[PDB]
């Protein structure tokens, strides 16, 4: 009868949909590899999809996925065991080397552009006429680390122009140089900005940007990576 045909049809459709949905989600990270980087023997029952090509705006070319995968950076790690599935110990300072929770990805060394082709993220000093409109204005506040020591002072907010939100605080250190801190990893209080992730001595180690009015996707990943790695790797100096 018409209902049994409909429900049997649906279950077949749903199997096709799950197959399509799963192969679509294999356009990054695949094929699977052994810990040594060689291709793994058993890849599972789902094949790689046919490549698709994204046309990037503002003449930045294309991306074709799936395509050849490479880290495009050295990985300071070493095996801790003679078989698969154990942790890989850092061979240096994991914060400096950018491994574990300090990991960054070799993204394009260009800034993200708005739809008009202008830098998405500018310091507020270079964005007419952006202002703090609500909540405590952090500019001029001392920045405290998880060791409860002052590391610097806020000297600007870096703002997403198109989405009108704060993204980083620009922080001046003892030496008069500045660093970006992600907005999502600080606590703005009445009289200070508190950073749980980092101690005062680890602020100098924050990766520096190569131009004072723009930050590239690579630099964003290095900064955000480094600061998150502090939660694990600066836990000795947290109080």
């Amino acid at each position: 009868d018409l209902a049994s045909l409909a429900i049997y049809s649906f279950w077949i459709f749903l199997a096709g949909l799950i197959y399509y949905l799963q192969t679509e989600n294999m356009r990054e990270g695949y094929p699977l590899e052994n810990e040594d980087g060689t291709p793994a023997a058993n890849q599972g029952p789902f094949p790689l999809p046919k490549p698709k090509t994204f046309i990037l705006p503002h003449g930045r070319g294309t991306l074709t996925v799936p395509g050849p995968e490479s880290e495009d950076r050295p990985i300071a790690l070493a095996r801790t065991a003679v078989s698969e599935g154990f942790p890989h110990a850092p061979t240096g300072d994991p914060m400096k080397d950018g491994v574990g929770p300090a990991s960054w990805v070799a993204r394009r060394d260009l800034p993200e552009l708005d739809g008009h082709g202008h830098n998405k993220i500018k310091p507020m000093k270079a964005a007419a006429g952006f202002h703090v409109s609500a909540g405590k204005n952090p500019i001029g506040l001392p920045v405290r680390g998880c060791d409860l020591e002052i590391a610097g002072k806020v000297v600007d907010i870096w703002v997403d122009i198109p989405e009108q939100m704060a993204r980083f605080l620009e922080v001046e250190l003892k030496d008069g140089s500045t660093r970006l801190l992600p907005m999502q990893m600080v606590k703005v209080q009445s009289n200070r900005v508190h950073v749980n992730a980092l101690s005062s001595d680890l602020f100098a180690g924050i990766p520096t940007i190569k131009s004072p009015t723009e930050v590239t996707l690579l630099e964003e990943d290095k900064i955000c990576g480094y600061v998150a790695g502090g939660l694990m790797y600066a836990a000795p100096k947290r109080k």
Partner: protein, 281 residues
């Protein structure tokens, strides 16, 4: 095996318990102490269900049903054969769910991410514990809990609902349903907006967040933003489950009459109670 980008993230540390002892992977799966805990509670729980399916005399998945103790047993233990297996399985189920959430916290700590996922999961756990623990205990019997069976658990929903008339009239149920419906609306819109921007008209360049903001202002005069829609989905879905638990915690405890009759508080207010005409006069 590993995703191409995975090795650099497989460092030691993050564990809450047992240091480096269970700090390893089986294929894609992170283990940890709470991995072992989850396997134990789950395996024991599955054995007890198979045992329950023996004492019941059916190996059919559409028939197997573990019932709570009968109301006469109150909040005491009961023979395995009559609701004691349900009692032990319920402990095993709570053990596996809570273990699964703490395992997610270990995975968070290793990956240096926020704890938003296990926090969200704890709301699903809270709903389960409402039906099998908090409500039964408040009502004085494990019997008011739902049985573990595919169709018998549906039977319970139907009998529990119709005990208080049409359950639609529970006002906390009304609010819970509104959040469930709105969540699905918001998930459809979100999936569709990002895909319409990444997958534009043939030949054209990828759109930008700007196009996504523009599209929604053109359509309804407001765009919540790309951070806002992720905040909104978390809030709509957690709210649905909060009000779900609330609608059932108040049912058979502070309110045990017909839900439809609760609405007379509004109709019988002094200033219009006696005015003639309408549906209620």
């Amino acid at each position: 095996a590993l995703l191409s980008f995975e090795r650099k993230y497989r460092v030691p540390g993050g564990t809450l318990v047992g240091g480096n002892l269970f700090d390893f992977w089986v294929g894609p799966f992170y283990v940890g102490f709470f991995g072992v805990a989850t396997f134990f509670f789950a395996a024991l729980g599955i054995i007890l269900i198979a045992w329950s399916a023996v004492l019941q005399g059916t190996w059919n998945p559409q028939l197997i049903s573990v019932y709570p103790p009968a109301l006469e047993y109150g909040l005491g233990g009961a023979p395995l054969a009559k609701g004691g297996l349900w009692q032990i399985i319920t402990i095993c189920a709570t053990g596996a769910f809570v273990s699964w959430a703490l395992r997610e916290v270990e995975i968070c700590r290793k990956l240096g991410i926020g704890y938003h996922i296990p926090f969200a999961f704890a709301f699903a756990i809270l709903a389960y514990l409402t039906l099998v623990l908090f409500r039964p205990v408040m009502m004085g019997a494990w019997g008011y809990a739902f049985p573990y069976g595919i169709w018998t658990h549906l039977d319970w929903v139907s009998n529990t609902g119709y005990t208080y008339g049409n359950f639609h009239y529970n006002p906390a149920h009304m609010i819970a349903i509104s959040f469930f419906f709105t969540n699905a609306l918001a998930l459809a819109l979100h999936g569709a907006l990002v895909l319409s921007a990444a997958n534009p008209e043939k030949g054209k360049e990828m759109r930008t967040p700007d196009h996504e903001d523009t599209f929604f202002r053109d359509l309804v005069g407001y765009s919540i933003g790309t951070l806002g829609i992720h905040r909104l989905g978390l809030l709509l879905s957690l709210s649905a489950v909060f009000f779900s638990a609330l609608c059932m915690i108040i049912t058979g405890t502070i309110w045990f009459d017909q839900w439809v009759d609760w609405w007379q508080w509004w109709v019988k207010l002094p200033w219009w109670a006696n005015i003639p005409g309408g549906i209620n006069g």
